């Protein structure tokens, strides 16, 4: 067509200019390749973590700079590159396109357009490795993030800027809760107030291309692709792609954050990123530190997740909410990679396989799922109702274990046990069903205030739907008041109490 011709002419003119300018400013001869790591001679004054051009066409980057030989990890298939290939250096640190044009576009780790929808329009290029903001640039997490899960994700919130972990086994709902959060962000990014929009960005690292295709299909089915970036590295490409894709997603997240906007990033299954770094380090001549893992895995998780922060008003008040995901084996949260990531994050969301198999689709264990925004960085309506409900539910679980231990004044005779079991049955959700914050307070308020003593565990599922229909049909006054105010006052508390003990009889 017309555009390819002029684009090709302009770019080849620039190519001739580059070839005729300063020679190439450095080169190298390939000494070894394999598993996406390539040794190369030359490159005497190569910059650290610097992109390099290979004669075949594969990209590269410099993790290691030995005397004489340079450790280059190959960005793509290593089949094309051979021995003696000339390795031109790009002259700049590893970068990735960042800007508002990445919205609605799927790109690789390097930022090149892979969805085939056209070129990427970026305001600038940001380094994949960027130092995290300092103490003063960081701000206390106070702005809520509407997870839309109608579960413990609401009573103990996420908030804007938290790196709330999502631990659990495979196929437990980590990607499910991530996509529900992304879908629920549509209600707030579909407006005009940029201070409340959450421009999501997905990191589908170590995810099969069929799965990510289904994920993007589901996103655009719900009109969620307009605000979500799917920068990722599937299982098809090499390990360095997997290692760098979350970091470039972090770069996009800081671009959104440094511009005063709020972005939600979900590092889906960082485990493949860690093992990709393992694959790099095994043949890059970096000895492993512990449990066959190189020591720098904790450091890389640190730099990647600490970039996620809530900026202060001086820096633009931007937020970079992070939702890291780890795939543990057999629920072993005491393994190495778990221990580091649970110590790297601001709380976690446990998703055990037994709860998923039991029937609870969210499958979240209240007892261990903690956060640093307890009754903070919430709407306010939910924070007053269930500011300390997690501890009560944990004590309910302990007493229920204690209740089965011996026959005493326990079981149904315990008001705490009854309230805990009713609340645990309350905290459930179906996938692809984002529930707004307004239709979440009455259920938890009925649970916490002991209004569910005579509703029975089996009937709580129907009670949820009946109560929500009650509010959305003939009690929309207080519901809309809560939604618009973002808080339940004395008037709103009294109205909600009126509704709940009027509907307790049904």
């Amino acid at each position: 067509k017309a555009q390819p011709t002029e684009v090709s002419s302009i770019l080849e003119e620039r190519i001739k200019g580059v070839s005729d300018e300063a020679n190439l400013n450095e080169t190298g001869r390939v000494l070894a390749v394999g598993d996406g790591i390539a040794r190369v001679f030359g490159l005497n004054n190569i910059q650290a973590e610097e992109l390099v051009e290979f004669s075949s066409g594969v990209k590269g980057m410099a993790l290691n700079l030995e005397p004489g030989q340079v450790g280059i990890v190959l960005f793509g298939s290593d089949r094309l590159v051979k021995e003696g290939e000339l390795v031109k250096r790009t002259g700049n640190i590893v970068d990735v396109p960042v800007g508002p044009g990445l919205l609605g576009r799927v790109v690789d780790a390097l930022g090149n357009p892979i969805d085939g929808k056209g070129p990427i329009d970026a305001a600038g290029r940001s380094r994949a490795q960027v130092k995290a903001p300092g103490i003063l640039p960081r701000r206390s997490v106070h702005e809520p993030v509407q997870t839309g899960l109608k579960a413990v994700d609401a009573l103990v919130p996420i908030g804007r800027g938290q790196r709330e972990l999502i631990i659990g086994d495979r196929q437990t709902g980590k990607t499910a809760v991530a996509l529900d959060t992304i879908l629920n962000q549509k209600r707030w990014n579909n407006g005009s107030d940029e201070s409340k929009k959450l421009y999501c960005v997905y990191v589908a690292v170590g995810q099969k291309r069929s799965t990510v295709a289904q994920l993007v299909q589901t996103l655009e089915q719900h009109d969620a692709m307009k605000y979500s970036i799917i920068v990722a590295a599937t299982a098809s490409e090499a390990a360095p792609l997997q290692y760098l894709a979350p970091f470039t997603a972090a770069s996009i997240g800081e671009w959104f954050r440094d511009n005063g906007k709020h972005a939600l990033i979900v590092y889906d299954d960082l485990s493949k990123q860690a093992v990709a770094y393992r694959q790099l380090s095994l043949l890059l001549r970096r000895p492993p530190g512990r449990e066959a893992y190189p020591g720098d895995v904790f450091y890389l998780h640190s730099r990647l997740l600490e970039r996620a922060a809530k900026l202060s008003e001086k820096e633009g008040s931007g937020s970079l909410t992070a939702l890291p995901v780890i795939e543990t084996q057999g629920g072993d949260v005491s393994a190495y990679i778990p221990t580091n990531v649970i110590s790297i994050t601001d709380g976690q969301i446990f998703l055990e396989a037994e709860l998923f198999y039991k029937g609870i689709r969210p499958a979240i264990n209240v007892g261990l799922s903690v956060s640093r925004v307890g009754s903070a960085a919430q709407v306010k309506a939910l924070k007053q109702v269930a500011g300390s409900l997690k501890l009560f539910l944990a004590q309910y679980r302990e007493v229920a274990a204690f209740a089965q231990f011996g026959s005493d004044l326990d079981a149904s005779t315990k008001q705490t046990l009854v309230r805990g079991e009713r609340l645990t049955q309350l905290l459930k959700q179906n996938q692809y069903s984002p529930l707004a914050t307004e239709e979440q307070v009455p259920l938890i308020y009925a649970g916490v205030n002991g209004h569910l003593d005579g509703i029975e565990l089996s009937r709580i599922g129907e009670f949820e739907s009946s109560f929500l229909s009650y509010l959305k049909s003939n009690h929309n006054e207080l519901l809309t008041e809560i939604r618009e105010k973002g808080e339940l006052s004395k008037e709103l508390l009294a109205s909600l109490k009126s509704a709940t003990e009027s509907f307790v009889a049904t």
Binding site: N44, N45, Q47, A48, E49, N64, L65, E66, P67, I93, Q129, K131, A132, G134, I135, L136, R138, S140, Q162, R286, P287, P288, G289, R290, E291, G295, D296, F298, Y299, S302, R303, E306, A309, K310, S334, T339, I342, S343, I344, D346, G347, Q348, L368, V370, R372, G374, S375, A376, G387, S388, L391, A394, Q395, E398, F402, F405, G406, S407, D408, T416
Partner: protein, 472 residues
């Protein structure tokens, strides 16, 4: 003539520099590199030979080329010291993290100094009324000593550190220094804001705390050496100023973690479970540089993150032996409902003496430990054999132990948003009297839930009355 060197190898956080002269810089020397974005400091670790040495990067090796000019300071890394550092955020290299201008410190002491000798060891058994029931009862804290806060992930270690700061530093009177070793920057920002609000930090006036942050986002060398920087601040405050230093080192396990970090790429053979071989020695000098001398005292308050809640891990296990007061925050109690989570058994302190805390306090502590140990021993008996299938005395001891465990819970002011109850404080004498009365069985009829999230025995009886009124 300044010492000049050229960079030969850059391996992550490890940088190799060669000097084209016989004047080789000594170990731990500060090597500064002029980067386009600022200044990068390198600390010499080993002399590899051939006029080349191995260094540790204080900052991320961004754009580090081979052959870049390196300048040797001549001594170890020096950070500003004195009253100027109070109310100011201190980086690992000494540059002011805060944007409140530079630091006009009179002296810049190096971060690598010999620990105080055995002669200058002024040991003491002074008590410390922190205000938390369990620590004031079972493992009383020692003024001027070393303080431990062992715990896993999500057990309240940072919350406990903040609560201790709020309780003590406000009434401490003397100078203090908070040292963040490999911890989340968001938590450091929250702590800074909280101490600004409480008046501990006064930007426009006098501040009683100096802030040194080596946050977990920083490179491994910065994490390793921020503990040394804060320790140097505490040492100068103790010696020159002659004031009781309330050193609050946060996540001291990150120092050993960064030692293992650099050790893997330093060529060292990994020790057991992959730790650095020199962990014991380097942490030995670091911790022994904290001690009570004749000039003053440094009351180091350290929180240790135990990996996988495995107390047999070499770093926490050796920190146990290299520390006076131990406060283990077991997860099994943290998820049990008593989020203070101070395990009442392994949390031991050297102050547990009849001549230190008093005979009555010692007897009370021994009896509560006995009751809780009976509970732990009969855990399985209650579990599957049956609680009712037990002797009357054993059942009474189990009930008393459960009541005590519920009583160990204490709301924290810094955790008011977390627990939902105002963070009231309890005095040591009040705790001793209340626990002695409880052990006598004067509150057996009171339900166990009355002791939940309460302070003194007055809070216990008030909660019992309120639950009786609401339940009828």
């Amino acid at each position: 003539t300044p010492i000049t060197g050229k960079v030969t190898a850059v391996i992550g956080a490890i940088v190799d520099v060669h000097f084209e002269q016989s004047e080789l810089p000594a170990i731990l020397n500060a090597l500064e590199i002029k980067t386009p974005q600022g200044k990068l400091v390198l600390e010499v670790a080993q002399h590899l030979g051939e006029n080349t040495v191995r260094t540790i990067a204080m900052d991320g090796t961004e754009g580090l080329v081979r052959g870049e000019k390196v300048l040797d300071t001549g001594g170890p890394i020096s950070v500003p010291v004195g009253r100027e550092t109070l109310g100011r955020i201190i980086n690992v290299i000494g540059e002011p993290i805060d944007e409140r201008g530079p630091i006009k410190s009179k002296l810049r002491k190096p971060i690598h100094a010999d620990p105080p000798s055995f002669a200058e060891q002024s040991t003491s058994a002074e008590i410390l009324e922190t205000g938390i029931k369990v620590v004031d009862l079972l493992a009383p804290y020692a003024r001027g000593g070393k303080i431990g806060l062992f715990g896993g992930a999500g057990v309240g270690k940072t919350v406990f550190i903040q609560e201790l700061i709020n309780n003590i530093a406000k009434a401490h009177g003397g100078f203090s220094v908070f040292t963040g070793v490999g911890e989340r920057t968001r938590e450091g920002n929250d702590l800074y804001r909280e101490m600004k609000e409480t008046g501990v930090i006064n930007l426009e006036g006098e501040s009683k705390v100096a802030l040194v942050f080596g946050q977990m986002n920083e490179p491994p060398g910065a994490r390793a050496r921020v503990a040394l920087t804060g320790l140097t601040i505490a040492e100068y405050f103790r010696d020159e100023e002659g004031q009781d230093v309330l050193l609050f080192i946060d996540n001291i396990f990150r120092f050993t973690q960064a030692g293992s970090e650099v050790s893997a790429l330093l060529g060292r053979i990994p020790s057991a479970v992959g730790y650095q071989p020199t962990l014991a020695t380097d942490m030995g000098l670091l911790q022994e540089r904290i001690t009570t001398t004749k000039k003053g005292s440094v009351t180091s308050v350290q929180a240790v993150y135990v990996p996988a809640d495995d107390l047999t891990d070499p770093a926490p296990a050796t920190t146990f032996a290299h520390l006076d007061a131990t406060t283990v925050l077991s997860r099994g109690i943290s998820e049990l409902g008593i989020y203070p989570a101070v395990d009442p058994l392994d949390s031991k302190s050297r102050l547990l003496d009849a001549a230190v805390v008093g005979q009555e306090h010692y007897d009370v502590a021994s009896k509560v430990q006995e009751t809780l140990q009976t509970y732990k021993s009969l855990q399985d008996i209650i579990a599957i054999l049956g609680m009712d299938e037990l002797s009357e005395q054993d059942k009474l001891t189990v009930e008393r132990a459960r009541k005590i465990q519920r009583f160990l819970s204490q709301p924290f002011a810094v955790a008011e948003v977390f627990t939902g109850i105002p963070g009231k404080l309890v005095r040591l004498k009040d705790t001793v009297a209340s626990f002695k009365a409880v052990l006598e069985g004067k509150y057996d009829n009171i339900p166990e839930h009355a002791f939940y999230m309460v302070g003194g025995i007055e809070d216990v009886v008030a909660k019992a009355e309120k639950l009786a009124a609401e339940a009828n």
